[PDB]
């Protein structure tokens, strides 16, 4: 609902460390893996399976077991500089092409 951060500077520097993000989940009952979420730069909000990216501030919810943290990060927050640093634009393109073709 707020604009996504597309700068090279994290919106939430307190959540810049993997272990800082890990602590936010607590006991995690959800179908998607908390360490996989923390690696894709997500931390838990404490409200269902709502996560936000530390860098772009981008929020996601309702994780199906088929949904991949990095993939969803690229789908919904393609301007994220953290995503670009970790995954590269070749990965990012692939994923975009795949979900723009998932539609048919
Ligand atoms: C893991 C996937 C994620 N999607 C997309 C999703 O979660 N998005 C895409 C969008 C950017 C439109 C969005 N904007 C708000 C929220 C809520 C929020 C979450 C964190 C913090 C603050 C608010 C979620 C959300 C879902 C499918 N959903 C669920 C709601 C709409 C949508 O497309 C499936 N699982
Ligand atoms: Na918890
Ligand atoms: Zn991000």
Swiss-Prot record:
Please report the PTM annotation for this entry: S-Nitrosylation down-regulates its E3 ubiquitin-protein ligase activity. Autoubiquitinated. Ubiquitinated by TRIM32; leading to proteasomal degradation.
The UniProt record gives the binding positions of Zn(2+) as: 53, 56, 73, 80
Cellular localization per UniProt? Cytoplasm; Nucleus
User: Which residue ranges contain the repeat BIR?
Assistant: 18-83
Tissue specificity annotation = Expressed in colonic crypts (at protein level). Ubiquitous, except peripheral blood leukocytes.
For region Required for interaction with SEPTIN4 isoform ARTS, the annotated ranges are 15-30
Provide the effect of residue 63 to R.
Answer: Reduced interaction with HTRA2
Q: What is the effect of changing residue 96 to A?
A: No effect on interaction with SEPTIN4 isoform ARTS
Cross-link Glycyl lysine isopeptide (Lys-Gly) (interchain with G-Cter in ubiquitin) maps to: 75, 81
Region Required for interaction with DIABLO: list its residue ranges.
Answer: 82-103
Implicated disorder: Lymphoproliferative syndrome, X-linked, 2: A rare immunodeficiency characterized by extreme susceptibility to infection with Epstein-Barr virus (EBV). Symptoms include severe or fatal mononucleosis, acquired hypogammaglobulinemia, pancytopenia and malignant lymphoma.
What is the stated purpose of this protein? Multi-functional protein which regulates not only caspases and apoptosis, but also modulates inflammatory signaling and immunity, copper homeostasis, mitogenic kinase signaling, cell proliferation, as well as cell invasion and metastasis. Acts as a direct caspase inhibitor. Directly bind to the active site pocket of CASP3 and CASP7 and obstructs substrate entry. Inactivates CASP9 by keeping it in a monomeric, inactive state.
Domain free text: The first BIR domain is involved in interaction with TAB1/MAP3K7IP1 and is important for dimerization. The second BIR domain is sufficient to inhibit CASP3 and CASP7, while the third BIR is involved in CASP9 inhibition. The interactions with DIABLO/SMAC and HTRA2/PRSS25 are mediated by the second and third BIR domains.
Q: Which family does it belong to?
A: Belongs to the IAP family.
What assembly does the database describe for this protein? Monomer, and homodimer. Part of a complex composed of SEPTIN4 isoform ARTS, XIAP and BCL2, within the complex interacts with SEPTIN4 isoform ARTS and BCL2, SEPTIN4 isoform ARTS acts as a scaffold protein and stabilizes the complex. Interacts (via BIR3 domain) with DIABLO/SMAC; the interaction inhibits apoptotic suppressor activity. Interacts with HTRA2/PRSS25; the interaction inhibits apoptotic suppressor activity. Interacts with TAB1/MAP3K7IP1 and AIFM1. Interaction with DIABLO/SMAC hinders binding of TAB1/MAP3K7IP1 and AIFM1. Interacts with TCF25 and COMMD1.
Q: What is this protein called?
A: E3 ubiquitin-protein ligase XIAP
What organism does the record attribute this protein to? Answer: Homo sapiens (Human)
